[PDB]
Amino acid sequence: LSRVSLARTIGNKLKRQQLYIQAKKANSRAKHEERHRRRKEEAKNPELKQKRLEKNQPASIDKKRIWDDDSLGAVVDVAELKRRRLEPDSLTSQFPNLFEPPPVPKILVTTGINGTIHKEAEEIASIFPNATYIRRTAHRYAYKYSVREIAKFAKNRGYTALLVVQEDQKRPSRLVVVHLNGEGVPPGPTLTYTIRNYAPGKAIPGHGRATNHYPELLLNNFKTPLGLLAAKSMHILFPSKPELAGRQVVTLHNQRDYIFFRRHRYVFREARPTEKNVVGADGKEMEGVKGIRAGLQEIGPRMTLKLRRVDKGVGRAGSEGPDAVKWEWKAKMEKKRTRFNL
Amino acid sequence: LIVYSPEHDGKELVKGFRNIPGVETCPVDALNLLQLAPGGHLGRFIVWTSAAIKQLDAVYESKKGFFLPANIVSQADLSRLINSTEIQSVLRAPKGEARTKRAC
Amino acid sequence: VRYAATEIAPTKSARARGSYLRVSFKNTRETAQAINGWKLQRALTFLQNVIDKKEAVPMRRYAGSTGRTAQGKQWGVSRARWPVKSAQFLIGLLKNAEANADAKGLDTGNLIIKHIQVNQAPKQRRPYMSNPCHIELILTEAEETVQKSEAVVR
Amino acid sequence: MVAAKKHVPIVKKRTKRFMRHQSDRFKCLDSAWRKPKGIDNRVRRRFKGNLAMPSIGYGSNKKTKHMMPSGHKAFLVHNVKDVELLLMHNRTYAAEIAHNVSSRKRIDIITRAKQLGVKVTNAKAKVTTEV
Amino acid sequence: MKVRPTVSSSRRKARKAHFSAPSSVRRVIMSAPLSKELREKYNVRSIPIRKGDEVQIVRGAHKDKEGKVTSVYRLKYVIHVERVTREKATGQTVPIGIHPSNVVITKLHLDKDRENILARIKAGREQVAKAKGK
Amino acid sequence: SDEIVWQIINQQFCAFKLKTTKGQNFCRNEYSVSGLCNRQSCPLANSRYATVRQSPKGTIYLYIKTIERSHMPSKWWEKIKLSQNYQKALEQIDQRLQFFPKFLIHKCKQRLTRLVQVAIRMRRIAAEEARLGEKLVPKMAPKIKKREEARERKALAAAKLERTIERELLDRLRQGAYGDQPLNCNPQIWKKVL
Amino acid sequence: IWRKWHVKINQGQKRFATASALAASAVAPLLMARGHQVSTVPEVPLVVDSAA
RNA sequence: AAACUUUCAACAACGGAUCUCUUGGUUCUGGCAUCGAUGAAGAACGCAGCGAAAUGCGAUAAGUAAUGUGAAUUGCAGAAUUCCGU
RNA sequence: UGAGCCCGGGUCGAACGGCCUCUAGUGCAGAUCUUGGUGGUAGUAGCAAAU
RNA sequence: GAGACCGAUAGCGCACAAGUAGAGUGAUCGAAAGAUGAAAAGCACUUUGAAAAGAGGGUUAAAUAGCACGUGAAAUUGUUGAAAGGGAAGCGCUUGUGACCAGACUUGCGCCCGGCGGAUCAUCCGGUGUUCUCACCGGUGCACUCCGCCGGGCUCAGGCCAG
């Protein structure tokens, strides 16, 4: 009953149902008997269990991932390219501003025209250190300011980052990340993402506030040049030197093009008798941290971001050359589940 | 609706327009009301021919026991009937206007 | 707008499901309500005592007067019974949940039953109808509250 | 000055719906009004403290009839052809896009109506703003 | 439209015949078109296929994949072509099902009967072409 | 037969009619000056008629239909191009529709002024949209939305966030990325790290 | 099956209504009224040559 | 305050309603005349590798001959069965 | 006014609607109504045939 | 071969094991019961555990599409949350409190300056189609006329509610 369909062979509902139930009960019975016998043999001999554990591992999309065979379009692992050369310059050339030391960040936060997500946007400004939220209109029938204009205004007043939180269904839906750069450098990359599952700390159970201390960023699993671009943009958005006295972590973990944002705080504590020791991946039971764990209490909002568009200047209206758009997410690109753009 | 004469135009256009979608073909001697007024709505677009016209004359005189009806109205233009010199002369003075002012 | 409370982290949580179980829905509901919201070891010892006739599950909603003993003082309810098969299958299901949590890598010491829901199942078409049940239970490690660092003025 | 014409103030004689008798106590009875036919029913006899009956007296003013609170009458629109039908009379009617209209046709209706000065009641159905 | 009384336009009867046709009728239904060079070499549009035809795919998720026909499953109205396979859960490769209407013939497995079939179809074609022309 | 065609078009059927529940019937004919189906403005029942229409090229024309050319549908309408000056265009409408019914004169004037105002507003909104740089794009399709919802749930389940956060935190503590005398951790437990 | 399906209509009325339909076809606006897209033909009866 | 009872929201159960589909049914119409002692209609028993059901067949038993088509069967086992060929 | 109609949000996957007419197996709370499903009684009566 | 028919409580009792299952001594009575998915690709493997059962993990565009499978109402039930309950509930008119949700006029025309460019501007040239007097193009220019665009300047008008 694995290669043949009872619904397309047996024409009777009740006969098909009875045959299926009898066969599935028989299959479960046989599977449990076989596993019990195999349990007995692996209990009497401990080595064929090890051969089982080295021969059969569960299937994984991450290790079934398909790569291409650096121009910001090919999804190829930068580290793989690096030690293949040993056995990116294109990114630096395309974005010299992003890639020497960056100035101390200053962020201006605003929302869409006549937005109603003021508290959520103020919370985003709370995540981003040295940030100020200012509303866009200040009333219904005001002058409508354009994102190009606000970018120029903030550049002339000395900001370095402009974050725009667009809304839908009175909920934050998109984040446009503009970079103002320094001195005479024109306003640069605009990484637009999609704020999906947004949740405030107030609604988060067991939460807390963030403190004024500068937290350290954990940018996890960014491998393709686009992932490195996004990671460096967030690194520019956050301060370089965290105040380690204020034990706060801001983590962006990337898996299958789904960037996950979380904010927690440290407690490095000894392991309780009922707890485990943090086991290593492929190399379990890390050596050196043998009796100590880390306590995490989420003190920040839950959002998931997914990059859709990065542009050269401040949006499509502002990108003018023959390479106006640098990347655009497409369902044709995401058709195959093993194709990750990151 | 293509109308022809089987006596002079023949029966090849029947198939020629039979294949074309939407268009129909009907002889002049067997005009069909279902095709003349589809769905009860008047004004069917009909592509005629000269033989068809000269045979409409013949068949509509040939129908026995039927005559072309005499209508109860000669000048169909009611605007002509009302806005004419004789009527406007014979009418009396108006007693008011189209929109009457409110008195109290 | 308003935001509903977000779910606890799946890798801080453990889930267990038992469908089409052949135990009375009312008895399972009463036992689940009795053991709801408790410590894992407390619940297991409670159910073992229920089997050993030591501690009684109080009936509140589906209550039929059967026993009026001194074991009902600890709940304040005058009607208490001992659902044997309920206690046994629920022990099995929390053991399955504990195994699942151990596989996920949670601290075995601090599992607490946040959620246990008992629903009715399709009736066993044999007029005498049986009442099977579905039981789903969700467990977590105890919520952790941690220190603040003193805010620095600047 | 972009609004509806000067209009007589909208006065609603009754705002609450007329509820079917005993529809509260029986769920099988829908809340839609059904005139009772019992010879001794209290609601039909119009006793005090019973559900009122619909009447042409409750019927509303003709000048303010079918008018939205903004003062426009809803026009069901399916395309830019319907918008161009509303061309001459936007101060009288407001566009209401049909539910089965696709996203791009919704966008075209919104764009043409904005160019045309026609208010749309549902301009945020399946669209979003992009910079 | 239909004029001959023998032919029927009933969708019910048409579907019944299509789903209960015998194997020869199934072959006739699962005839497939020939490629260009084949069409200008044989003056034929489409012939029924066999197990030894090199075929190219023009429709589906596996478009532009070339291979030799592996089998013709007449019961499911499908054909199996080489190297177009999917892996099951266990990993075993089952050949993916594709339709004669969605494939196009690139090479023919020629025998006496096939040559006779193409000759008959062709000869009819130039017969009627000449009849129309002159 | 104007009265007869009016009766047939109003009492029986009209392919250009869009009757609404709001108490007015709309006429879909492209040459109707008003958007309402009524005797005064029906292009089919009024043999002698006039209309104002705008070409794609921004040019405005006035169209004339007369009963002597009631037939010849290719030739029903005379097209006369109006000037860009509003006052002079109204005057030219006056001469070219002199002796016409007052209703048609009034509605031709109203349609001319409405088209020119619509042109003004279109240019204003084009400038405004240009100066803002914002564009209305469609939202995500429901099938795609289901796709990212399911793949997000699977991705989070495989991601196991807080475990990885602790992963990296302990990795950095072991590699000593917090420096000597870390302010993150207690000196006790630090000696355990040694 | 013995329900009345076919309706008896006087031949005089049928001929009268066919004549009325022909007059309606001769009337030009009625083509638009019935929905026929009639805008490029140079004549609403459109008699074409029997030779062609 | 809890328990219990009532109302509502989210979610989850039960159940198969609504929309959709139809190798079906019903009615009408057209062409033709054909069961059996040379064993009829019908009943039973057997025939397959795995056959429960259904179908086919009759110890030559999912059948043989002959003709036609022209490279299969197919749920699994199978042939050294057959491809310019009675 | 009303029987009802339109839209917004979610689900959902292949057809559907407005108007003019034509047609009818066309509008439900009852009929100790039909079928199906589901409750209180009740985890009660009692372990009785059936199961 | 067809239909202004019925569309799984309908249509023949039977769309599927249907005169089948089943009942009766017997003549006879006689049901219920359709839909995974495009393609089984029908969930590999690890791990619980005696099961028509789970946790991972995988297939699919989607598995809260998993042979209990197109969608999935109401009756009834459970968990969470809010409120209320001194011997009935439920309903009407009218506020108040709390919770959630929505978001008011869609908010512009006109005049006057300076520049720029296009045009029924030019008794300008050429071409085309035509209702033969109306249109549409190609080519020069800006003396006059009219439009816009830019940068100034001034004015007015507006939706609702109170005094």
Ligand SMILES: [Zn+2]
């Ligand atoms: Zn009209």
